[PDB]
Amino acid sequence: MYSFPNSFRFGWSQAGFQSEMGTPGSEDPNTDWYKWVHDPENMAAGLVSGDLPENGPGYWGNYKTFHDNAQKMGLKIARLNVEWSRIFPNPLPRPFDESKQDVTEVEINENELKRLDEYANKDALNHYREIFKDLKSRGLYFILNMYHWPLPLWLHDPIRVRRGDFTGPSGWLSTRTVYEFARFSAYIAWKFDDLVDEYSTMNEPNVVGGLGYVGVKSGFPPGYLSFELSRRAMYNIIQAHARAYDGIKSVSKKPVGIIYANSSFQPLTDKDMEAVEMAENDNRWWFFDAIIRGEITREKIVRDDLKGRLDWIGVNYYTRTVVKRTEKGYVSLGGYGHGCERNSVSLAGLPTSDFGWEFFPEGLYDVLTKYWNRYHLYMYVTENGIADDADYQRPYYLVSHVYQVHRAINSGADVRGYLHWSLADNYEWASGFSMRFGLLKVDYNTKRLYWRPSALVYREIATNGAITDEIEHLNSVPPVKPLRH
Amino acid sequence: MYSFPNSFRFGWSQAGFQSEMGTPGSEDPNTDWYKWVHDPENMAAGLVSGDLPENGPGYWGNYKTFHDNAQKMGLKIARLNVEWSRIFPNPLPRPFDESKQDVTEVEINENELKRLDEYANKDALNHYREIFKDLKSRGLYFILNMYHWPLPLWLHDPIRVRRGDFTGPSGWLSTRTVYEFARFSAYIAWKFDDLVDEYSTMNEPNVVGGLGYVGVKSGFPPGYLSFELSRRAMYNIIQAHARAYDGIKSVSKKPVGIIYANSSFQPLTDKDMEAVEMAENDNRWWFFDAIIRGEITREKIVRDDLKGRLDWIGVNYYTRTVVKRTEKGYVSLGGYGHGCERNSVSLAGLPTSDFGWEFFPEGLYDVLTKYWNRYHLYMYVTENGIADDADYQRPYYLVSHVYQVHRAINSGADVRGYLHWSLADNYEWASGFSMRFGLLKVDYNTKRLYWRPSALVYREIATNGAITDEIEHLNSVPPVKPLRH
Amino acid sequence: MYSFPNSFRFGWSQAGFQSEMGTPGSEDPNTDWYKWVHDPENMAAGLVSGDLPENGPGYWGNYKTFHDNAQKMGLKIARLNVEWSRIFPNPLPRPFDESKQDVTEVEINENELKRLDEYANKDALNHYREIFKDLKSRGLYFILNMYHWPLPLWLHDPIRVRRGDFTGPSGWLSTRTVYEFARFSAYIAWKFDDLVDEYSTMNEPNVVGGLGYVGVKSGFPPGYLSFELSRRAMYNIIQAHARAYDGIKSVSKKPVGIIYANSSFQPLTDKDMEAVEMAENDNRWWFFDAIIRGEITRKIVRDDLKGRLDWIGVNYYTRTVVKRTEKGYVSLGGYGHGCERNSVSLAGLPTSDFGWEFFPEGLYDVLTKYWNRYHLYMYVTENGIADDADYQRPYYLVSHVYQVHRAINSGADVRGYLHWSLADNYEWASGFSMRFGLLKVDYNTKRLYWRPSALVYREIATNGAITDEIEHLNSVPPVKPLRH
Amino acid sequence: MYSFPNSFRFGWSQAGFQSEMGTPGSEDPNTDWYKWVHDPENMAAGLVSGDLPENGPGYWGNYKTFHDNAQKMGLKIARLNVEWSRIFPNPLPRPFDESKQDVTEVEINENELKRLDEYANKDALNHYREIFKDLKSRGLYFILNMYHWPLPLWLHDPIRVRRGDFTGPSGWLSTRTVYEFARFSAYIAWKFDDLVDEYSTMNEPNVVGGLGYVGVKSGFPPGYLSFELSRRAMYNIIQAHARAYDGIKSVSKKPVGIIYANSSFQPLTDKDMEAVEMAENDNRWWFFDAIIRGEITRKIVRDDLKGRLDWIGVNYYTRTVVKRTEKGYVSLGGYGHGCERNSVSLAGLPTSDFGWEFFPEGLYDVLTKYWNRYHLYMYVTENGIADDADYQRPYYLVSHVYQVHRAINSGADVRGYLHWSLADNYEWASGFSMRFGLLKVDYNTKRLYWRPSALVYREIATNGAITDEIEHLNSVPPVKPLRH
Ligand SMILES: OC[C@H]1N/C(=N\O)[C@H](O)[C@@H](O)[C@H]1O
Ligand SMILES: OC[C@H]1N/C(=N\O)[C@H](O)[C@@H](O)[C@H]1O
Ligand SMILES: OC[C@H]1N/C(=N\O)[C@H](O)[C@@H](O)[C@H]1O
Ligand SMILES: OC[C@H]1N/C(=N\O)[C@H](O)[C@@H](O)[C@H]1O
């Protein structure tokens, strides 16, 4: 048996855009992501799958059923977001010098919050209250995240930007978005603080800027290929996180963290340890050193307005990245980690998921302990999961990763929960519905939810607060012989 | 949901030779099967795997744990056998004309039973009582089967017979074995009737004679290739069943049936329906017409001593057989049913097990309804299961077959239980330990039992007496795309 | 036996950018494609493989060896191109109103050619002459193609355009490229007509416009996603074809054709035949009806477009399966070029190292459809398979050659079969990993090796037939031993 | 380039029972093997495939075509056998005490040969003469083998023996077979010495005894499982070899050898070298030490066994991996001949249609070990692969031929390489599905087709070398595109 602390919580994470739509009356056409996935040119190019979010699992209407199953499964924590676009579907009054690079302060007071309240959609606000009240009534501790990728269209027209036209609303390329996100986050905290246990500002900002402006084959908006603009978006999102932290703290005493996309960097050969360190710098430390230590590049400076804006770290983990040394520095290798063939085996002989992601649970131990040792901030594992409609690998994937969290705690790391991605299948961005990450399988025709055998396994874990002796054998690699190569 | 009658029982089947040994003090070296699997020439030839039963899951010593898990899983029925060899390890007094073809009667009375009792091993008898009492204490209804393949060595030296020497104990080739089996069965019923709910005489006699004397590549004892001797063994086993039925009835009022190896015969093309009928005659009806209607070939005769010796039919089902018409009659086709490649796909694109057996749950409906329509005797599904260490396919296999039993009942067939093969992994005959059929995985080093996710699924079924709405999606074919081709 | 007419020739096709570089001294940095595959951002995005064409098979230096092997293989025809960038690496003085949509005429004469002559790189001109003379000396009939995708950088800066900046050299989006292309083509014919047997203006203009401005995941320059700009590019390249035809004919009496990317459109179900016809309209007929019948949409007849084609080069690899929809028709993934690599299609047919389905019947379909609509003679200017191991190529080669025999048998005038390609080469955005050669290239030494399919092709070419002994290869590669 | 000595010959091997039947008039029902594969019980058991050799490739009728193709392929050597059953289909009068264990001498002279002559089938004798003369006329050096597994039914009724009945004709279990074999072999040399270049007494006697009486799942006659009878069979066949050697030498001065089944024994870990040596003793040295040095266990020296060998025929397909145990050593499944069909071994190496691992290094190992122990010259009398598709064969062929070049380079006297086989044939208990031919056979028409490997072998044989152009095929077939 592997037993967890009495205060440790098992649960799940979910995003608004991916799960909300699907039931009558739930449609939210007012984001960049919505327009992006409906775009005829994006469709013809194959940048997006052609599946549409309004045909989704319908959490907007069916949230009670989701919660009923989560309670039956013994879950005790949930992390969800509000969609910015549903609360402010129309523009707010121009407030502030758009040409200044830095946003060091955003003043928000009771009077400004009351003005904002005049513009907010009240049906959306009341619906979210009805969702969150139900959530809390099933004994789920609630982490509220402010942002999980889609921006209101009045803040970002991604097609115009894809086209190389920067005269319109330009998303994370504009400090206006930074200013409005701060106000939005303070506002949400102001409205929902009675229901919330902890806050996250953002989900995976590094993915927003990285796939948006560099990894353009991923079909993430605005899909404009530019190193320079990727840096500018990342700079703005960092200061937005900081301003949102101050904003929430102005109305709440509760903890405020951030959720980030992690990979475990692994050396190809024993001569590649430095390459790993450089990769960890370039992908992880530079970001967290900005929002914790205020250290940033603009020249290399310390900003007092950035320093100390973080109470906890949300660790999103799926797989590793294998790196090797170069003359220039380091490179990541194809055929390991997230760059494998789908339903196959990596160059290391480890099985890959429906998404082509390599099975590597040890990497979670690596990531949790590395964060712990650098910053000594407590963490939650805010995402971990696998694309697997058949449920062949998921029982092993779940048990193995949960075990590595037990290992991290054992070594001294403060980790207070594990939240699987996800409770149910949902709309996987540019890939559409084909990538199924749910403990529960969704029939998209009826919206019925089904317990995959992994869900029964998770229920064993959660109800016992332990990997029990009876399922401990799942702490292993799925046998590769009967799977596709 | 698919709900079963309130009186319907879900459970499991297990064989003594396959599961008993493994714990200190459990060794039974006194069968033909034991000698067969230890034989140096059989090993060198690869007729047997080289694995040995004395390294097995240890039900002899660990039965309480097996039963504890079966109770936790909500099971309510079990079918097990006594090993003849453990009760009578030494020969009994010659009793009876060995040259007579037919055995129409075997007189057994109280006095003869008391004499037999002088020769029986009392430690073995008391141990089996301790096993069965525990079984009954977990609320399991008990089907006691008399015979599941291994014969005492004093009745069969399979190596001598393999060598073409018929001067020694010749197993089912001798009417002495028929006479002794009758006495053995009456004796066991006489000793255990207070603990038993229903009786089976034999498990799969058609396999004993078919693999023993025709399908010699299977490495079943005595492995002597002879159409003529296969017919003689089958003739003797039929009359043995009949004499055992009379013997048990002499001491018990309880129901007495038999368990038989079934395949669903399927036509290659729509012009092959007659081929199916001929296959059903040659593999199924000829046998059951003998022991129910007394009809047999010796010339084609009716034996009053055979007629009506059957209260119920145990249906063992794994997969189909595809047949086509010939000039001579019919032939079965490779690449379907049990003749596929391991961990692959059949010629019909259906996934195959670790044993190379094709996924075909519809065949169970075929078999149950065919039996029902011919004889109108109630049945139990006494075996159904899959070789699958990884547990990839078993969740689908279990749910799908259980569904087909619901279908058969719905159509009017009297089916009173479903017994999975098996509760735990065990020694799979000539194949050894590599073929794992358990709901529970066995670690053969420690003898610890582990719940595969299919076991959690079975528990849902059994505790609810239904395929619940939540697991109903498993009533489908395992997706082939992520599995080996 | 399947015997071809005595005049039928077997040979091969190759492209300058794909095969020329690799030997020191061969480097041509002056194209949009060179810049495109060296671009840091494109590399980081994975739009290009990171492989570089200067590490190629080195036809520039080693052409004599290529030709030696082709002769040993019994080949009697070759289609190659000159690279525009090599001949005119520096910008030409502006000549002509750039805002006019149509380019109906480009005046070229002796004096204008002599002027152009003074900008041309003479080292490049003499080298091509040396390559083509050696070609001719090995008995190879010569189809000279003017254009196989790279443009001089002075006509197209693809990174600027990718970035959404239209103030620079804009490639096929500008009538200046049309004008200069007409002049380039007249100029090359003027210099090389003594060596050339037939001309092609261009290779697969449909792919240039289609992957350049719509299929942007393919990493083709300039990778600017726009239906409107895709139409404009195609409009320009059509008129460039016509002006190039007139330009060549002003200096030569030899046949002038075009090489085009074809797929065989096949119905998913028997209820999808109309979808096939719509697909053929949208992908094939619209284009050829423009340059043959002058019919275009801008729906009019342009007399400067009409009749500008003597022959049709058919490039064929695989099929495309289509179904009817409400709005029209869609192509289906899991068939044709949209399959998993080294696997099988949704129909159970084997796929190549590139994920393309084995479907040789499609070639018969494409040849006979063209023949029945236009009655212009054809060459199969490309057909081949990405297959480093050589597992499928023997079957692929014999099966497709058989379909050409079928086409001829049914009445179609097909005059040659040119395999893609003689040796491995640089496969555009995919780099070197896609190996189409009858000959394998060791890129470290530039040595060529005969894959067994080359021995099989020698049998066909030397005999002018699929011989009795290799006739079994007219079948699908057995899928059981291959990856699924 | 890898050039062979000028005297080195490339060719092929084939067996009478596997290749002769198929043409009407060729049927030979008089062997144990014929009876064995027609047996109803064996068929029902799956011990034999159900395929029948009378539906074969038809070398009996079509030998001229086989030879025509072999000549076109540049082959200069052939090893075949006469079928005993064809020459003596009826029982010979009993001659000699059958209960004596040793057969140290068999007296054969002119008069005894003339007597035998009166029992011989003359139609069969003349037909073989016609086949061998046509062979010789195509420039093929001729190795005549006396025995390649089938015995006349009058010497072995395999079904009787399978059933455990030892009162009938018992094949290699009886010294009568030894006696008659010596006489048969002297007789054939007597009739055919004018046509023959070198002799082999027998093909793979280790397999006859080993699969016949131990590996009974292989479906080899008589399939009676007995360690003791396996030893007795092997003892008899050894002395039959020796008596056959003396018999041939009484009528001929030509070289007399033996063809044997080899595997290259390889250690699982570096701690398994002793296991390899024990494996080589138990599978190879014990046998050759008997017929070369007269050393045998009955542990003595037999002067009638000593020195009865001029040359060694090495049959090689794959390796066997072994490990040390307490009791000795064991062979490991997942390597060598014990792999899954059309997949990869535990070492990641591709396997054939028969499940045999690609391991050409083993041939170098086997050739040099023999050479170093005995210093007798060798021929590679079999090497090939079950591969209907021809995916692996080009690599298999070139790689193994290279290892022969390696062996010669290191000093071993190897004089030829004979591929198994020229055309597909009847693969014993497996039937026709295992196709080893350089030429594919259509069994419906008996037509032969050149797989691309045949074109590759023509390159090797005609040049007497692995040429520069095919040298890349000296490598492992890429596993990525193949089934796993
Ligand atoms: O891929 C599954 C999830 N993975 C994620 N990060 O890796 C995203 O936060 C989430 O929205 C889903 O995309
Ligand atoms: O193959 C699994 C089981 N199958 C059986 N019949 O098919 C036997 O009764 C049982 O003992 C096990 O062999
Ligand atoms: O893909 C192989 C070839 N195929 C082509 N068209 O499909 C191009 O003309 C040629 O340049 C190569 O890309
Ligand atoms: O397996 C291919 C050949 N291999 C053989 N030995 O391994 C036999 O000599 C020959 O008759 C064929 O069986």
Short mmCIF file of N, CA and C in Angstrom, two decimals, chain C residues 427-459:
data_model
loop_
_atom_site.label_atom_id
_atom_site.label_comp_id
_atom_site.label_asym_id
_atom_site.label_seq_id
_atom_site.Cartn_x
_atom_site.Cartn_y
_atom_site.Cartn_z
N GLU C 427 13.70 16.03 -50.55
CA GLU C 427 12.23 16.10 -50.71
C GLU C 427 11.61 17.32 -49.99
N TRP C 428 11.96 18.50 -50.49
CA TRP C 428 11.32 19.75 -50.05
C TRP C 428 11.29 19.92 -48.54
N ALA C 429 10.12 20.22 -47.98
CA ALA C 429 10.00 20.44 -46.55
C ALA C 429 10.32 19.18 -45.70
N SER C 430 10.16 17.99 -46.29
CA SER C 430 10.46 16.71 -45.64
C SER C 430 11.96 16.37 -45.56
N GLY C 431 12.79 17.01 -46.38
CA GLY C 431 14.21 16.75 -46.32
C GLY C 431 14.60 15.45 -46.99
N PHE C 432 15.72 14.86 -46.53
CA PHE C 432 16.24 13.68 -47.19
C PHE C 432 15.60 12.34 -46.84
N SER C 433 14.76 12.29 -45.81
CA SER C 433 14.30 11.00 -45.29
C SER C 433 13.37 10.28 -46.29
N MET C 434 12.70 11.03 -47.17
CA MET C 434 11.84 10.44 -48.22
C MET C 434 12.66 10.11 -49.47
N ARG C 435 12.90 8.82 -49.70
CA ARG C 435 13.87 8.38 -50.67
C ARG C 435 13.11 7.72 -51.84
N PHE C 436 13.07 8.41 -52.98
CA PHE C 436 12.30 7.97 -54.15
C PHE C 436 13.16 7.32 -55.24
N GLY C 437 14.46 7.21 -55.04
CA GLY C 437 15.33 6.75 -56.11
C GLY C 437 15.24 5.26 -56.49
N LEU C 438 15.33 4.98 -57.78
CA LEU C 438 15.71 3.64 -58.22
C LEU C 438 17.12 3.35 -57.69
N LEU C 439 17.93 4.41 -57.56
CA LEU C 439 19.27 4.32 -56.96
C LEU C 439 19.31 4.97 -55.58
N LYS C 440 19.91 4.27 -54.63
CA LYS C 440 20.03 4.77 -53.29
C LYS C 440 21.25 5.69 -53.26
N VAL C 441 21.14 6.80 -52.54
CA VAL C 441 22.28 7.73 -52.35
C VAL C 441 22.84 7.65 -50.94
N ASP C 442 24.15 7.43 -50.83
CA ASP C 442 24.84 7.60 -49.56
C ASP C 442 25.23 9.08 -49.53
N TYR C 443 24.56 9.88 -48.69
CA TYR C 443 24.81 11.31 -48.71
C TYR C 443 26.20 11.72 -48.13
N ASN C 444 26.83 10.83 -47.38
CA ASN C 444 28.18 11.08 -46.88
C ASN C 444 29.21 11.08 -48.03
N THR C 445 29.06 10.17 -49.00
CA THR C 445 30.08 9.99 -50.04
C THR C 445 29.52 10.37 -51.42
N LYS C 446 28.20 10.57 -51.50
CA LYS C 446 27.50 10.77 -52.79
C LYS C 446 27.53 9.56 -53.75
N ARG C 447 27.90 8.39 -53.24
CA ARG C 447 27.88 7.17 -54.04
C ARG C 447 26.45 6.75 -54.33
N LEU C 448 26.22 6.23 -55.52
CA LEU C 448 24.91 5.67 -55.90
C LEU C 448 24.92 4.14 -55.88
N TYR C 449 23.80 3.55 -55.43
CA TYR C 449 23.65 2.09 -55.38
C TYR C 449 22.37 1.67 -56.08
N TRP C 450 22.39 0.52 -56.73
CA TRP C 450 21.24 -0.01 -57.44
C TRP C 450 20.38 -0.78 -56.45
N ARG C 451 19.24 -0.21 -56.08
CA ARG C 451 18.21 -1.00 -55.39
C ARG C 451 17.72 -2.06 -56.39
N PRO C 452 17.25 -3.20 -55.91
CA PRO C 452 16.71 -4.25 -56.81
C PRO C 452 15.66 -3.74 -57.81
N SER C 453 14.84 -2.75 -57.44
CA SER C 453 13.92 -2.16 -58.43
C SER C 453 14.60 -1.58 -59.65
N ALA C 454 15.84 -1.09 -59.49
CA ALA C 454 16.63 -0.60 -60.63
C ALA C 454 16.96 -1.74 -61.59
N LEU C 455 17.30 -2.91 -61.05
CA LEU C 455 17.51 -4.09 -61.88
C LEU C 455 16.20 -4.46 -62.62
N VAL C 456 15.07 -4.35 -61.93
CA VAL C 456 13.76 -4.64 -62.53
C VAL C 456 13.46 -3.61 -63.63
N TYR C 457 13.76 -2.34 -63.38
CA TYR C 457 13.52 -1.29 -64.38
C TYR C 457 14.43 -1.50 -65.60
N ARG C 458 15.66 -1.94 -65.38
CA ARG C 458 16.54 -2.27 -66.49
C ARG C 458 15.90 -3.35 -67.40
N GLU C 459 15.24 -4.33 -66.79
CA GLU C 459 14.59 -5.38 -67.55
C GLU C 459 13.53 -4.78 -68.44
#
